[PDB]
Design a protein around this ligand. Structure first.
Ligand SMILES: */C=C/C1=C(C)C(=O)N/C1=C\C1=NC(=C\c2[nH]c(/C=C3/NC(=O)C(C=C)=C3C)c(C)c2CCC(=O)O)/C(CCC(=O)O)=C1C
Ligand SMILES: */C=C/C1=C(C)C(=O)N/C1=C\C1=NC(=C\c2[nH]c(/C=C3/NC(=O)C(C=C)=C3C)c(C)c2CCC(=O)O)/C(CCC(=O)O)=C1C
Lengths: 486, 490
């Protein structure tokens, strides 16, 4: 459940109840633009930001209670044509206005229910920066060999077009955590490459909102938001949804985070693959930065292109990895034809590198042998005894401490486990073991990157590197072969 | 196998041997530009088109045997940097040049093996009426309800940006055929919406070539190609691969087709999903069109974006369809709980077992007797069909044309061309058979034996004779789920 917003008797957002914060209805916008809401049918301006009078150059009393057809006679029909009733709030229609007071303005309108939300930012007359920018970024992404090079080129490209001090790319691991897989920074800044952060750092509502709206920015981390007048929607006397508004006021908690990082401005472009938030492009600047809408649009384009390239490169990496496992598997099967303990213990066969494991346990003919980093012999006997109790032919776990409590002490030597049964039961089996996940800092007790890394390692205590799904499939495929080779 | 090109003793390209045409090595370019090839390491200009001398403004003898550093000292280092050796040939590097002879030119270079292929076209700025038109179009495509709305918005958008008289989108059916699912045309032109063409109209080489390079242009369908001098690659004395070349001469067969349509210029944007050519965006104009480089960037972007979005919207259409079949399945299962007479229960028009599988006929075999619902072939043919089902193994049988799988049933094609049978009990004593009529369609325009669109539609209908509408995967899955449901009803 969500807490009520602060302007409706809502509880104060703290570090303990930050998950239930209604970040989609702050009732306020960022001061670098102006926001208006009008009826979807009539066009009567209802809500207004307190700074819209200064931005538009028109008195606040005159603007309210005035139809959009009188204010914007050239775009109102095309606005209703672009945003039909029932359209998703993600659908945005942008047009350029020319006013004598504020110059050229960028209008961004989206429809939420029965309410049209218009956003106003200062724009350029003609933007020739973008036509070739899209060409160069697209060509740069198309010339990447693999995922790592793709991410490096992506971050460097974003930094080149924008000028941000730091541009990073997070990948979301299956456990909802994040990891900086590539980074392009200015000379003289600590590196976040390889740093990982817990899932609690990005709340659920923030992730779903990032999936529905790919771009979201925080212009000034120390600027106060500009409320809406009125704060509630006169049509329903209910909070106004600002998830689709790019001018949405950033949550005070996240602004406190960025201030604890020395970041003045932040911008995030989502990377969605298959309808899932695969990763995120982050931008950090030490000074308050407001990206112009025309160039920011180029960043959005880059968001879509990177989603496609990540899809392709991941499919190719899993294809080549699966094939490499099949060639290694053929290398083992040929040795299984002319064969058990002495055969599989051959270092030339390398059963450790097959599953990328640190330890190996081979149970055959009433005896067990080990290879690599493996817990002491009595601990091995206890582990095999527990393996016989487990049903099925395949056992897999990222952290053996959770599935086997008495095996929590042997976690640093064997945290991840992947066991298969050659014969029915567990009389003859093959067990792969992986050590505890150990990492080092990429470079205050309060919330921040330091705290985040510390709590990330504390939350993954006892865990190991997760088993790749192709290694699991290949494990069962190997079990079926060795069953018939004896 | 491929036939040798015309400049190596190759046979004349006719309508009978058009499949084996080496369209990737025509040895010539289109006359609206100039093409050069140079060594990937040194930069020595090797091959040249005979019109490049007039186009570039320098004598042909002087250009050959001259390094690219001497011709273009400003772009050569960035050119070699942008196209490193080993890069894919699909990778294109585009830049604008200013020459005193021909004026401003658009350069498009790609690397094939040890050969750098440079392309020169006359250029111009491009002013789209909507500065925000591309962005608004992007959100319009992403906020599309289904695949057909997505295609409609896509075609209309392409026509708006380009100005072509006709803009269409083909979807490639599993049987490698094509179908125009959306169209944006100028007022006063016959519609191709719903028109289908056979797989033979686009050869395999053309399909793969469309997969590797998203954009393909035919400026003038009545212009003669300009050969290369020399025609072979001096490095290997082998034909020069022009699949990456945008100036590659279009096959004479396809130009003859477009002329039979009255189309002067053609432009194609490929739609690649999962490494497979899912569909294609075609543009037809009565006048030759040369796209500005900025517009090329916009179309390529729409190619990739549509490649991404079509996958999403199609997956969503299959999700909603499967959900509709799940509700339809539950409504029948509730009637299977309270059973009185199985034959009378499934024959209920309120349950609508015909609309469940989108079938025209239904055969219900239980307790040694069989009943029918809807358009069903005569009774003795039904007895023969059920006996053939007893010969057939498995619990589920599916076919688009039963005449191929069962020869003696070819005569029953008009009443039941497609077949989907499930066995309630083990064996075929009790079974359920869905039947679909022969695929019948109508012309896209509604009013010549030579090569053209009409010919394509006619040969498409002759190749789909005896065939029916293919079974949607959700209908098959729901069929097996229904077998598992009805097994426990006994
Ligand atoms: C439970 C409350 C929150 C804690 C604690 C916290 O750290 N953030 C909390 C709420 C929100 N985070 C939002 C966006 C966001 N958060 C991160 C987290 C990081 N974790 C790290 O370890 C590091 C660096 C070492 C970071 C930066 C990121 C990357 C982002 C998105 C990027 C960006 O927009 O700048 C968030 C969303 C608000 C909004 O934009 O509307 C909330 C709320
Ligand atoms: C076996 C030779 C060919 C016959 C016969 C033929 O009709 N085309 C043949 C070869 C090529 N076709 C190429 C592209 C292409 N072909 C079609 C087919 C159509 N089917 C139709 O119903 C219609 C019109 C109503 C057409 C035009 C299409 C749609 C296309 C794609 C481009 C376009 O729409 O014009 C082709 C490749 C040419 C190249 O690479 O430049 C060859 C070769």
């Amino acid at each position: 459940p969500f807490f009520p917003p602060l302007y409706l008797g809502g509880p104060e957002i703290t570090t303990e109840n930050c998950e239930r914060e209604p970040i989609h209805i702050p009732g306020s916008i960022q001061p670098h633009g102006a926001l208006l809401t009008a009826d979807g049918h009539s066009g009567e301006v209802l809500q207004m930001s307190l700074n819209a009078a200064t931005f538009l150059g028109q008195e606040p009393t005159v603007l309210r209670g005035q139809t959009l057809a009188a204010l914007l006679p050239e775009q109102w029909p095309a606005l209703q044509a672009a945003l039909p009733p029932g359209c998703p709030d993600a659908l945005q229609y942008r047009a350029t206005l020319d006013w004598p007071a504020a110059g050229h303005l960028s209008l961004t309108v989206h429809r939420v229910g029965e309410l049209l939300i218009l956003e106003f930012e200062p724009t350029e007359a003609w933007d020739s920066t973008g036509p070739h920018a899209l060409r160069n970024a697209m060509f740069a992404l198309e010339s990447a060999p693999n995922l790592r090079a793709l991410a490096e080129v992506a971050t460097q490209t974003v930094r080149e077009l924008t000028g941000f001090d730091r541009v990073m790319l997070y990948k979301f691991a299956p456990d909802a955590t994040g990891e900086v897989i590539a980074e392009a920074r200015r000379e003289g800044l600590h590196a976040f490459l390889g740093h990982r952060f817990p899932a609690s750092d990005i709340p659920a509502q923030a992730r779903a909102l990032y999936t529905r709206h790919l771009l979201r920015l925080t212009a000034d981390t120390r600027a106060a938001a500009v409320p809406l007048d009125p704060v509630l929607n006169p049509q329903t006397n209910a909070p106004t949804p600002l998830g689709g508004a790019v001018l949405r006021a950033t949550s005070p908690m996240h602004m406190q985070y960025l201030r604890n990082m020395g970041v003045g401005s932040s911008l995030s472009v989502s990377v969605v693959v298959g309808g899932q938030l695969w990763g995120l492009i982050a931008c950090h600047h030490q000074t308050p930065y407001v990206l112009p809408p025309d160039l920011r649009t180029t960043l959005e384009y880059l968001g879509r292109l990177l989603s496609l390239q990540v899809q392709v490169k991941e499919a190719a990496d899993v294809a080549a990895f699966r094939q490499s496992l099949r060639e290694h598997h053929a290398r083992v099967a040929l040795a299984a034809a002319h064969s058990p303990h002495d055969t599989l213990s051959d270092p030339a066969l390398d059963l450790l590198g097959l599953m990328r494991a640190g330890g190996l346990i081979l149970r055959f003919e009433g005896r067990w042998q080990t290879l690599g980093e493996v817990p002491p012999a009595p601990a091995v006997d206890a582990l095999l005894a527990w393996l016989e109790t487990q049903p099925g032919a395949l056992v897999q776990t990222d952290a053996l401490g959770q599935l086997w409590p008495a095996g929590a002490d042997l976690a640093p030597s064997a945290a991840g486990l992947l066991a298969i049964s050659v014969g029915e039961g567990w009389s003859e089996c093959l067990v792969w073991l992986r050590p505890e996940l150990r990492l080092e800092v990429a470079w205050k007790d309060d919330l921040g990157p330091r705290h985040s890394w510390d709590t990330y390692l504390e939350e993954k205590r006892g865990y190991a590197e997760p088993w790749h799904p192709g290694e699991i499939e290949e494990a069962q495929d190997l079990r079926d072969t060795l069953t018939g080779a004896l």
